Ligand binder design. Structure first.
Ligand SMILES: CN1C(=O)[C@@](c2ccncc2)(c2cccc(-c3cccnc3)c2)N=C1N
Length: 370
């Protein structure tokens, strides 16, 4: 029953959303980051200064060694571990237990976050991008193959809403909970099964078209990633977006350290002038070729609380990333079975009495992909 699954996520602002899981026998309780942007189930399995608990394979009667190592260097840092399998459950998820691959992390750099309260990562994306290669079946694939759970999951990330702010949300596995959203669910195709890749066909700031060749919005790809905090945009698009946002909020000036996403700005208790910042609309490709639908986000989503805030839109060199701050406005359905992603206005999204996040379509757009 989906009711048991409601509010099963927690986190700290800017530090990811995590769900409680158990690994091994007897069950070892760990908090695990819900990450649609990667494809390994990777868990701290050795002492680390930021870890207050970790996976102890020797304490597990059901652990099985794969006798194989894994090394994952990446932009921000790296992680390194040992492959095996064990029994895994999600206490506030489906009532099943699965045998899944587990990368036991033995060494890492800049991977874990101080005080985040999670000890591992659940990569929900596809095998194509699994480390060390695509033969290592990802968790969700094992779950679907081993149980009768429908090949779909959905995420309602709620954020903080009014010490880093604590956030909450829901991960519904195997279905769609109609109490978590209002209005219509609109679907955009999954272009390819590796990341959750999608196509953006245009973007507006306060109703004003950025007027770019749509290839620019997806250069070199566009993905939906619960494991990225910000909305990240390709250089050309980022610059155009900030120019427009700057002009919209011209009354009142901020330092470009703020626009560069590393400097906070503060008002005091309920004085924040939301009405000065514009809304942002991303139009996603519809299931029908010449159609699209728009998701519209507010400043309440793209100014992340830290009353202090940081600009949560930043530049990318690896394509558009629709991260947590974009997802927070919405109920997002990862319909793997039908190769599509749905968006509907979330029952929990933060907004004032003049504006609201929105999902609206269709818009007919009469080649946007990389
Ligand atoms: C972008 N991204 C990463 O860098 C990370 C990753 C996962 C697996 N191997 C390499 C990188 C990742 C790793 C650690 C922490 C985060 C993170 C940090 C802050 C907020 N929320 C997620 C993300 N997962 C995503 N999606």
């Amino acid at each position: 029953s989906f009711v048991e699954m409601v509010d099963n996520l927690r986190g700290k602002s800017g530090q990811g959303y995590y769900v409680e899981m158990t690994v091994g026998s007897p069950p070892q309780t760990l908090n695990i980051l819900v990450d649609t942007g990667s494809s390994n189930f990777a868990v701290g399995a050795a002492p680390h200064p930021f870890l207050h608990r970790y996976y102890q394979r020797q304490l597990s009667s059901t652990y099985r060694d794969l006798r194989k190592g894994v090394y994952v260097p990446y932009t921000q840092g790296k992680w390194e571990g040992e492959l095996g399998t064990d029994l895994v459950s999600i206490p506030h998820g489906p009532n099943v237990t699965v045998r899944a691959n587990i990368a036991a992390i033995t060494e890492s750099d800049k991977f874990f976050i101080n005080g985040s309260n999670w000890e591992g990562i659940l990569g929900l994306a596809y095998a194509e991008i699994a480390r060390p290669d695509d033969s290592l079946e990802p968790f969700f694939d094992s779950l679907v193959k081993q149980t009768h759970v429908p090949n779909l999951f959905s995420l309602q990330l709620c954020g903080a809403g009014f010490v880093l702010a604590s956030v909450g949300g829901s991960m519904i596995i195997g279905g769609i909970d109609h109490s978590l959203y209002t209005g219509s669910l609109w679907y955009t195709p999954i272009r390819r099964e590796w990341y959750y890749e999608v196509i953006i066909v245009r973007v507006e700031i306060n109703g004003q078209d950025l007027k770019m060749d749509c290839k620019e919005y997806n250069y070199d790809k566009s993905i939906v990633d619960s494991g990225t905090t910000n909305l990240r945009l390709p250089k050309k698009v980022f610059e155009a977006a900030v120019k427009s946002i700057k002009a919209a909020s011209s009354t009142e000036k901020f330092p470009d350290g703020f626009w560069l996403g590393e400097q906070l700005v503060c008002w005091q208790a309920g004085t924040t002038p939301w009405n000065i910042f514009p809304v942002i609309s991303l139009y996603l490709m519809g299931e029908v070729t010449n159609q699209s639908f728009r998701i519209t986000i507010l400043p309440q989503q793209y100014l992340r609380p830290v009353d202090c805030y940081k600009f949560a839109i930043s530049q990318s060199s690896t394509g558009t990333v629709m991260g947590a701050v974009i997802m927070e406005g919405f109920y997002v359905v990862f319909d793997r079975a039908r190769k599509r992603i749905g968006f509907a206005v979330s029952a929990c999204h933060v907004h004032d009495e003049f504006r609201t996040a929105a999902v609206e379509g269709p818009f007919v757009t009469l080649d946007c992909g990389y």
